[PDB]
Every structure is written in structure tokens, then in C-alpha cells.
Nucleic acid binder design. Structure first.
Lengths: 129, 129, 129, 129, 129, 129
RNA sequence: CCGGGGGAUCACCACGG
RNA sequence: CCGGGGGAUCACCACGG
RNA sequence: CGGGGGAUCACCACGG
């Protein structure tokens, strides 16, 4: 098949859903963007490299924009008031089997499950305590 | 409310679940670990700081053990061959409201939802194609 | 046990209460922040140190914001029109027992009790007369 | 009308109350002192000034003594074994209305309310934890 | 839960018991002190660090004071005639499981059990022979 | 009386107890070890000296083997991965009476009593939180 | 290339290795 | 950072790596 | 360490 497909980044229950689609693979960096002007789009990038002799490194990036309409020179333009940036690096040893890797994915999913500590703190503009 | 509580990191459907619990709070850095030797434990740390004048920044770290052919409670060397490391840094502009932050969390959840490109690639020991 | 938890900074009956929650505790400085936009949040910090041979010194800071919306270029952001800054330093000799400290706290509470000179002047943009 | 009057600094039920009375108001600095030996008295001072173009600044000071008798050469005098010194500075922009100031006072009162982190730590010779 | 709780350091059978409580966690050093003036208090501190790549180090400190009342400048002050200092470092490899660690705790407890060699010598102001 | 006798280091309720016995007295340093190869033994050494004019100092050392997955009588390398080291230094001012010293011992016993913070943390492969 | 609860305007930058 | 049956007024100091 | 020294508030300059 091919895993370079579009997926929904922000699930808002069928309405207001932010879906992101493949837009580039130049230089080994897979890119996805929302159906917007490049200045207001959601961006997701991913890449893998054999960082060392004995392990691989996945580098993922996500950009969440705060869309706005700005007036520059008396003209209105679609812009982003600001952006939130997520940068993550995952280092996996070459000795990890597929089951070993599913474990990693499940842990990451559990980490952000609704109601858990971390996602709770982030959504409330607070720390852990 | 007080979010520093134990939670399920790896959900294996009730049986075989991996729970992670509070183990340290030195220097504001919250830590959680599973019931294992520190060399084979699942570790999670989180912390927030004001990186700059306009940004707040969360640093989240997760360590996952290689389980295939593992010897529980044994000395496994080299350490690098038996562990995966996840480094996450989330930058959020100071103008983000709680709602904005909820959306950011949703985006993170969507990025790793089962069946999506990234988690599928990682779990299959592969890249994008 | 822990006193690094959330508390009510401004008691407005039981609804419009301003609550402040732990956010960061790095380098011996505990920091509390109210929810939502960090740009419009109340901030409280506290620290203790041995200022000298016989003295222990507390440094407390509080920031009260004037919530407002800033529109520029048609782009509006949540900001603080201005902030009120309170900085206080309390020195207590190492000979002070717990009873001595309870008294010091009572004095601070009395100084600001409703109806007394100091709080009355501040609440009215006035000085002493 | 006058707010330069005596008030209760330490409320000990209704008997061992520490009352502080006007003593001097020279050079824009109001001073209150408790009765009896000046050497063992509680002291409170307050002043306001225009720290800058947009800011008005309050400077408040409080001294809590540790009453004791000093014998030297067979001659005993009433003195203060030591003193606890509180110095606070409050800055309020000239745009603050009376309501804004009432709020600032509420915040100060809340910060020191019985049971909250700060007063609890001080009353126990402790810091934050 | 939280293990940062108060505990009794010196058990004297319900009467004359020296109990110690949490008082600080600044800079990752957990501190406990007895309910005394800071100049006469019992002190207990603890901290963990990943000393090397393959092991952790616990650093514990205990201070036992000999309380006295000293007359400085004709005034009486609560002081400590002298202090006994206990400094201990415990290095545990990361490969140690929880059971491996309970073993360490039991050994330390056995080492100081009433009647055993070491505690006997210490309490008699003598060496081993 | 002559305290250099064997004793129970690890009390496992009669069955599975670890006894440690006198094995060396070279240079005034008393040593005790369990019945194992020196690479897997429980070791205890103790010594007293006058560190300075006003202080006497006890140096106590304890070595505990990692037991999980251990191979009795086998060659286990690296040595650092299979052993925990405890270093204790107790400083007692020359004015301490036998009674004073008994209290010091009690404090040490209390610090490590079952259920208290420190032993609980160590046994759970964790820190304070 | 590796490191940091280093920074960013975010596939970039500085520092230390 | 590591070491000492190095020292302390005890989260510090000196020395050797 | 000082100031009824200032701030955009754990920063800044002047004083020892």
C-alpha cells in the first residue's frame, strides 16, 4: 500500500474537523497541511534517519495556527495571529521488534488520553501538582 | 485539582496493563515510573516553564523498555540496546486560552490515533512511502 | 504533605473567585498562575533563603492584571492593559519559634484587615490623612 | 475625616490585642507605634509617591519585636531581643479605578488568608514543598 | 499518594517524642524539621540524583541538637550547645529491582537494631573490640 | 563487654535470614561478612576516630549484593552492576554523654523505621514527591 | 554527529563536546 | 563528576584524579 | 548588604 495518506488531526465529531493531507516529500521530509492558505495552514512533518549505528530517530513536527485576518496597508490578508509548535524526537534501538514498537505507540497514546495528568494540565494552562 | 496521580500508560485491555505512578518531584519536574528496576521501567517526566517573553514551554520525556527477550530483573547491557527515548517539547504562545489549549491537545491525540500514518509507520519499524 | 497546591487568591463570594494553581518550582522559586491566557493571568511567586547568619528571608511577589483585548491590524489578542505589582520581603531571625511566627502572620493579617488605615487608603486611590 | 488613627495590628481575641497609634507624620511618612517602651514597640509606616509618569507607589513597613529584658551590670532595661522586618512596595497605574483598587486589596487579603500556602509556610518556619 | 510526610524521628514512647515535618523542597532537597526555633530544630534532608550513567545516589543528612539557653549581651536566646551530624550516601545500581532495594532497607535496619554491635558501641562512647 | 560478634543483618523472620560475622580487624577497622564469595557477600565495616579537637567520628560502610537473577558462586561482571554501597559518617562532639549518644542512635533508628518516608522511597526505587 | 526541564519567528540558531 | 577509616561551624571546604 | 531608588517586575543603575 502506502502510509502517506491524509488523516484527521483534530477530531471535532464530523463537524469542524481539521483534516490534513500529503503535500510534500522533498528531501525525505514527509509533509501534510490542512486545506488552507499556506499562511493559515496546520502543518505536520515527519522523517526517519539512522541517527547512530545502533538506532533510528523519528523527528515529528506539528504546527497549530490561531487564524486571523490582518489589515496590512489598508488591505485584508489571511494570517495566523500566532502558532503553537510541537517538536518531538523518538529514538528506537534497531533491536526493537514490531511488538516492541507497538508498545511505544500505545504508551504515547496512553500519555495523552483524555483525563490523564499531562493532557489535563496542558488544557488548563497549569503545571502538575 | 491535583493532577499528579498514577495513570495507565499502556492499555492492554485490563489484563497486562502498564500503570505508571508518581516517583519524584524534585525541582518541579514531575516523574512517574512503573514497578520495575529503574533499568527496565517505563518512565515519564513533565515540566513547564516560560521559555521566553511570549512563549510557555512544556517538556515531556518518556522512556520505554525493549520487552522482547527481556530478562526480568536482570542486568542487560548495553543500556542503549534495551531502551527507546521520546523527547517532546510543546511551545504555546502566552495568548492561548484554555480552549486554544484543548484544541492543541486534540491535535496531539489525532496525530497518534490508531491507524494514522505516523503511529502505523513507527509500529511497523518503517518510514513513509 | 504539600503546601505547593492551588488556593483562592481573590475571594469574590463563591463564583467570580480567582484561583491560582502551581505552575513551576525551579531554582527555589515557587510560582502559581491563574487559568486561561497566561498573558492575562494573576501570578504569585515565593521563596526563602538564609539572607545572613541569623536571618531567614522570604521574598513574595504578586501581580494583578487589568484584563483587556488588544486590537491591532484587525487582529485581537487577550492581553493585560496594565499590571499592579506587589513585592514584599519578610526577615525572621532563626531564634523565632513557631509561636513567634504565628504572631508575625497575625500582624500581617491585621495590617490589611478591612477597615484599617492601610487597606482603606489603597482601596481608595488615597494616601494617609 | 481621617484614616491616620489607631487600629488593631494583632487581633488576639479581644484582650492581648496589639494596638498601634499615630505617632508622627513628617515628610510624607505616616508612622504608628504601639504603647509603652518605644524600645519594645511594634512599628508601622506608610507612604505614597508618584514613582513615575503612570505609576503611583506605596511603601509600607512593619516591625514585630521579640520582647525581652536586658540585664547588664545589674541594670535591667526593656528591650527587643530581635525584630522581624516586613517591607512591601505596591505599584498601581494611574488608570486604576476604585474598583480596580478594591480588587488589588482583595488579592492581598487572599494571599495571607489562614490556611493558604504563604501564611502557612511562614507560620511554620517553612518554605514551599 | 505522597511520601513527603511527617514522621517521628525519636520514639520515646508517646511522651517526649521528637516528630519531624516537611518544611522545604527547594532545589530538589527534601527537608524536615522539628517543631522548634530554626536554631534549635532537628533537621533531616534527603535527595536522589542519577550520579552516573548506571546508578543512583541517595544523600541523607540528619542533625541532632543539644538545646540550651544562652545569654548574649544580657539577653537570653534559644540556641544549641552543639550538634551531632549524620551524613550518609547510598549508591544503588539501576539494575536493582524493588525486592533488591527492600534488601538494602532491611540491612540498614538490622545494622542499627538495639543490642547489635554498632549501635551498642555508639551508645557507650566506645569502639568495637 | 566485647561487641565484635556476629549478628543478623537481614531479618527475614528466622527463615532466610542473613547473618554477618567477624572477618577482619586490621588497622582497627572491624569487618563482618556473610558466607559468600567476596563478590557476592554482605559486608559491614566500622571504625571510630577523633576527627578534630572537638569531634569524634564513626565511619560505617555496608555493601549489599543485587540478588535478582544472581548466579550463586558465579562470576558476575561488571561488579558495579551487582552491588550497592552505603557510606555513613557520624560526627559526635566530645561533650556527648552516653545518654546523648543513645538519643542519637534512636534518631537513626527512627529515620529508617518501616513505613517512614526515606525507607519507603528507597524500597520503591523512587524519590520524594 | 552527540548533549541541555537551551532559544525560535519552527526542518532553524547559539553554546558545550 | 569520581576518590579518601579527608575536615567542618554541616546541602560546605581543601586535596588528589 | 542599603535606599519612602526605577521597572515592562525573580529585572536594572547609583551606594558599600
Amino acid at each position: 500500500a502506502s502510509n502517506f495518506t491524509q488523516f484527521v488531526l483534530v477530531d471535532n465529531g464530523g463537524t469542524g474537523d481539521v483534516t490534513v493531507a500529503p503535500s510534500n516529500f522533498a528531501n525525505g521530509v514527509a509533509e501534510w497541511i490542512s486545506s488552507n492558505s499556506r499562511s493559515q495552514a496546520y502543518k505536520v512533518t515527519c522523517s526517519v534517519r539512522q541517527s547512530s549505528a545502533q538506532n533510528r530517530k523519528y523527528t515529528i513536527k506539528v504546527e497549530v495556527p490561531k487564524v486571523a485576518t490582518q489589515t496590512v496597508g489598508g488591505v485584508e490578508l489571511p494570517v495566523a495571529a500566532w502558532r503553537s509548535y510541537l517538536n518531538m524526537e523518538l529514538t528506537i534501538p534497531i533491536f526493537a521488534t514490531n511488538s516492541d514498537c507497538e508498545l511505544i505507540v500505545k504508551a504515547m497514546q496512553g500519555l495523552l488520553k483524555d483525563g490523564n495528568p499531562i493532557p489535563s494540565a496542558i488544557a488548563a494552562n497549569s503545571g502538575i501538582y
